[PDB]
């Protein structure tokens, strides 16, 4: 029996005019006996013939993986339209249906706070700048760092975590050479979320 | 056919004497025509007869699921012994192999840093006290907050995250009434990890 998994668009892609968001339908465990796969896509019940489909790809374990990618309108996703992938295959008496949507419930705007390196870390060679991001819903969110205008790439951020009030929070840690921080440079934690005004906010951090 | 998954013990369970860590072997998709399964458990290759197996598990899809739990002593696990589950089933041409053990690689002790609430959180009713815990390997760890010795319950901790050098970090967030932090109270971030020498380390944080 084949299996299908349905994936949402990347959070940033849904918030920028310059990006193009997509829902992805992945079909695994497709046999050599029946390698034929048909995709049908329905946006709130209405079929669309706009999905673009990749040729099948055999995996190490001798089964096939087939993926169908549907581009999405930004506002449709933000407004809660339901996206449905319908997969038919002869090893399968009735098609498989999977449906995806943005999460339900009142959006909540993130609060953003930046926290300097701890006092006890200044003996180390590099220091950690922390960005706390809390109180937001749904959990879709984008976080990056910039300095002097350009991006800063030596950072890692945690998955969102469910808080006690129903909101989410996460942390991001940007590590910089601690020569630079005592030198006095300015770094910025930049975050995008649908409940932010103009979709973004930024908070700065300096000695 | 039936499928097998083998799960390690819960992180708290490996770290305190008062708990009993266990390895859990789950078999899903076992048919009604052949519902009986045999479990064989091997500790570094030598069979042990100390595991407890619970009665079958009828699922929504009319399939049976079976779980057997092997309790393990802490020192074996930390010393790297391998645990092996062998599942035999008449609907299975050959028995199944699953083997689990503690994560491999040189252990490294966590570093603990406390970061006070951002001055801008001070307008809120509650403030966030954050504990950055970094540099540790393997990923099993216990993090809690207490004040005056007794525990603190409004806290949340992130999953471990792989840092760029192969070790892990996470953050823990304690929210207290902003009155509480102004009050002058002392809060403590307390952590246990197998690479610590004196069974715990703690760092304090106060106004």
């Amino acid at each position: 029996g084949p299996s299908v998994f349905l994936f949402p668009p990347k959070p940033k892609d849904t918030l920028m005019i310059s990006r193009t968001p997509e829902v992805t339908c992945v079909v695994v465990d497709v046999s050599h006996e029946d390698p034929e796969v048909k995709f049908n896509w329905y946006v709130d019940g209405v079929e669309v013939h706009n999905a673009k489909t990749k040729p099948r790809e055999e995996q190490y374990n001798s089964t096939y993986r087939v993926v169908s990618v549907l581009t999405v309108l930004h506002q449709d996703w933000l407004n809660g339209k339901e996206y449905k992938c319908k997969v038919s295959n002869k090893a399968l008496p009735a098609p498989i249906e999977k449906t995806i949507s943005k999460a339900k419930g009142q959006p909540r705007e993130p609060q953003v706070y930046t926290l300097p390196p701890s006092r006890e870390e200044m003996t180390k060679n590099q220091v950690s700048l922390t960005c706390l991001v809390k109180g937001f819903y749904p959990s879709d969110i984008a976080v990056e760092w910039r300095s002097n205008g350009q991006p800063e790439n030596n950072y890692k951020t945690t998955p969102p975590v469910l808080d006690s009030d129903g909101s989410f929070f996460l942390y991001s840690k940007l590590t910089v050479d601690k020569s630079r921080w005592q030198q006095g440079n300015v770094f910025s934690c930049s975050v995008m979320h649908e409940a932010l005004h103009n979709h973004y906010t930024q908070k700065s951090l300096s000695l | 056919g039936p499928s097998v998954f083998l799960f390690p013990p819960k992180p708290k369970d490996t770290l305190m004497i008062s708990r009993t860590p266990e390895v859990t072997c789950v078999v899903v998709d076992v048919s009604h025509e052949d519902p009986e399964v045999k479990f064989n458990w091997y500790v570094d290759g030598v069979e042990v007869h100390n595991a407890k197996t619970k009665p079958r598990e009828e699922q929504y899809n009319s399939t049976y699921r079976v779980v057997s739990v092997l309790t393990v002593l802490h020192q074996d696990w930390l010393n790297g012994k391998e645990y092996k589950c062998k599942v035999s089933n008449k609907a299975l041409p050959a028995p199944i192999e699953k083997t689990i053990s503690k994560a491999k690689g040189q252990p490294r002790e966590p570093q603990v840093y406390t970061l006070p609430p951002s001055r801008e959180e001070m307008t809120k009713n509650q403030v966030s006290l954050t504990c950055l815990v970094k540099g540790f390997y393997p990923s099993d760890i216990a993090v809690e907050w207490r004040s005056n010795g007794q525990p603190e319950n409004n806290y949340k901790t992130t999953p471990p995250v792989l840092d760029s050098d192969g070790s892990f970090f996470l953050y823990s967030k304690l929210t207290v009434d902003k009155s509480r932090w102004q009050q002058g109270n002392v809060f403590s971030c307390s952590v246990m990890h197998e690479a610590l020498h004196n069974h715990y380390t703690q760092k304090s944080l106060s106004l």
Epitope: H32, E33, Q59, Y60, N61, S62 | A94
Partner: nanobody
């Protein structure tokens, strides 16, 4: 029952060439992937090569260019064409039926093993 029988090992020389063969019981191989592994004394198992039902091939870095794996789907045998053999190729070689994904194989069945020895 379910068996895998290798054949073709033996004594070969540095720069020589050996061809292993591996025969599977009926069925156990159908629509499944076959791999070659090797084992020197005191050390452990290396991936050597593997080929899928569709014909995709995977090689360990140690043998790329030198070894070539091949398979006749209807004849239930897989081959390991070893060319230009070197001193560390000496080990006992096993064929298998594999699942999982190259980073983590699941071995359904194992062969008995054949010694390959290269002198200098």
């Amino acid at each position: 029952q379910v068996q895998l029988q290798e054949s073709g090992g033996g004594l070969v020389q540095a720069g020589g060439s050996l061809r292993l063969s591996c025969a599977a019981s009926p069925g156990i191989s159908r629509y499944k992937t076959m791999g070659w592994y090797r084992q020197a004394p005191g050390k452990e198992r290396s991936f050597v090569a593997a080929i899928t039902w569709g014909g995709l091939t995977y090689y360990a870095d140690s043998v790329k260019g030198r070894f070539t794996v091949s398979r006749d789907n209807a004849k239930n045998t897989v081959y390991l064409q070893m060319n230009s053999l070197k001193p560390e190729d000496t080990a006992v070689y096993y064929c298998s039926v594999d699942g999982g994904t190259r980073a983590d194989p699941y071995h359904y069945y194992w062969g008995q093993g054949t010694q390959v020895t290269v002198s200098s």
